[PDB]
Design a protein around this ligand. Structure first.
Ligand SMILES: [Mn+2]
Ligand SMILES: [Mn+2]
Ligand SMILES: [Mn+2]
Length: 430
DNA sequence: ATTATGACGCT
DNA sequence: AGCGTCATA
């Protein structure tokens, strides 16, 4: 009774950009605006690989990881923007810099956790308490929530979609008790008001639109965010969880999209998140381990405790390139040339990072893939990173991998390399 | 022959 | 440490 924890202590939001790289290119090139559009890397192999798709183009069935030539079969008028190439490789700097624009705006409202190049979590608990004390028991007007959906509403005793959003919002606000400054539903609502303000600032100041989710933890906020994309935000209350989860495939929850989620389904013979509630914590721990078991037990009830980490900057800076099919590197001079190309991009990004962020990387990780190996990475080795010098870094990288060559004579490289990776890690203040 | 990343868990 | 898992454009 009075003692069951309900995972309602925090207000957490996740803000995620809409079709992010496409918006970055559409801002730069107005001819791409309001069009079926995609962003592609490379060109020669099957038109290049698509990595971002406008919502107009999704309507034709265009997706990420589609070759452009195949996307064009679905959408003949599809417009394309190409990722920059520098030093023989795709260079993502434009999108990393656009990301910083957005992250710096979000940071004006709260400490954020950068979770990808286009999204961040926000713990709004404190900001909500202050807006509530300002409010002075003042009801929250629907006009303060112009792009908010309330998940699960409307319900009970118009065929438009905006009409439905407003009906749900009205039912939600009508049920609220604004008299209680400790009420979780009220706290989420005020959180949503703040996130409207945040999203308006992002669009005003960058031209980019985004979606958001507001809930009591990161997993629910992430799930919420996707429910009404694009250019909308969604509030998932604690009370909405049993209905939401009763038909929610397990794989849709963050961390459960891979082998663990598949094992949950197979071992327990279930399909939906809600079905997990019928197992004891010990049962779940027995199948999935102590940590996963406790996490699942709480998660299926809408409860999760992972903190929003105060980290706005990536903690690693890496450069990677695949060499697929017949382009695999087979000579020493080839390997050394590409290690240098990667190291030069790495130096450029590291030197900028040092100036911007007052830190220095201290470890260099070198990774390669060899032909035949299914695994992402075949080998991973570290060495010291003592100077931001591309020639030193590439020479050092070569030194750490040079023994991988099964060749008898030194000039050939075998088995051929299908991936090179350089990553700077272990930052210290400077 | 999607690729280019980036965080965190295990032992 | 090195490997594996899961994730995002
Ligand atoms: Mn996005
Ligand atoms: Mn995202
Ligand atoms: Mn995506």
């Amino acid at each position: 009774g009075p003692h069951m924890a309900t995972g309602q202590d925090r207000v957490v939001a996740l803000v995620d950009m809409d079709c992010f790289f496409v918006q970055v290119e559409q801002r730069q090139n107005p001819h791409l605006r309001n069009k079926p559009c995609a962003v592609v890397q490379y060109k020669s192999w099957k038109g290049g690989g698509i990595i971002a798709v406008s919502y107009e183009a999704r309507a034709f069935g265009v997706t990420r990881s589609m070759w452009a030539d195949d996307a064009k079969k679905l959408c003949p008028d599809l417009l394309l923007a190409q990722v920059r190439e520098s030093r023989g490789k795709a260079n993502l700097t434009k999108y990393r810099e656009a990301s910083v624009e957005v992250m710096e705006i979000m940071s004006r409202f709260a400490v954020i956790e950068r979770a990808s190049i286009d999204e961040a979590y926000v713990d709004l608990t404190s900001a909500v308490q202050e807006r509530l004390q300002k409010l002075q028991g003042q009801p929250i007007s629907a006009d303060l929530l112009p792009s908010t959906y309330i998940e699960g509403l409307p319900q009970g005793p118009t065929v438009q979609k905006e009409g439905m959003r407003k009906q749900g919002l009205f039912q939600w606000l009508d049920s609220l008790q604004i008299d209680n400054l400790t009420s979780p539903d009220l706290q989420l609502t005020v959180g949503a008001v703040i996130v409207e303000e945040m999203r308006a600032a992002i669009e005003r100041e960058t031209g980019f639109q985004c979606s958001a989710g507001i809930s009591h933890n990161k997993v629910l906020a992430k799930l919420a965010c996707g429910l009404n994309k694009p250019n909308r935000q969604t509030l998932v209350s604690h009370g909405s969880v049993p209905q939401l989860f009763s038909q929610m495939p397990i794989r849709k929850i963050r961390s459960l999209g891979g082998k663990l989620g598949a094992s949950v389904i197979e071992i327990l013979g279930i399909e939906y998140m809600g079905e997990l509630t019928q197992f004891t914590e010990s049962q779940l721990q027995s199948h999935f381990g102590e940590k996963n078991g406790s996490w699942l037990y709480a998660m299926c009830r809408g409860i999760e405790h992972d903190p929003v980490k105060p980290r706005q900057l990536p903690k690693t800076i890496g450069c990677s390139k695949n060499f697929p099919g017949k382009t695999a590197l087979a000579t020493r001079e080839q390997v050394q040339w590409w290690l240098l190309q990667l190291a030069q991009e790495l130096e450029e990004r590291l030197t900028k990072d040092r100036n911007d962020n007052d830190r220095v990387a201290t470890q260099l990780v070198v990774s390669i893939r060899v032909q035949g190996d299914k695994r992402l990475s075949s080998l991973r080795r570290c060495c010291a990173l003592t100077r931001y010098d591309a020639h030193k870094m590439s020479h050092d990288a070569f030194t750490v991998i040079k023994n991988c060559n099964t060749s008898g004579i030194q000039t050939e490289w075998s088995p051929p390399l299908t991936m090179l990776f350089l990553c700077a890690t272990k930052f210290s203040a400077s």
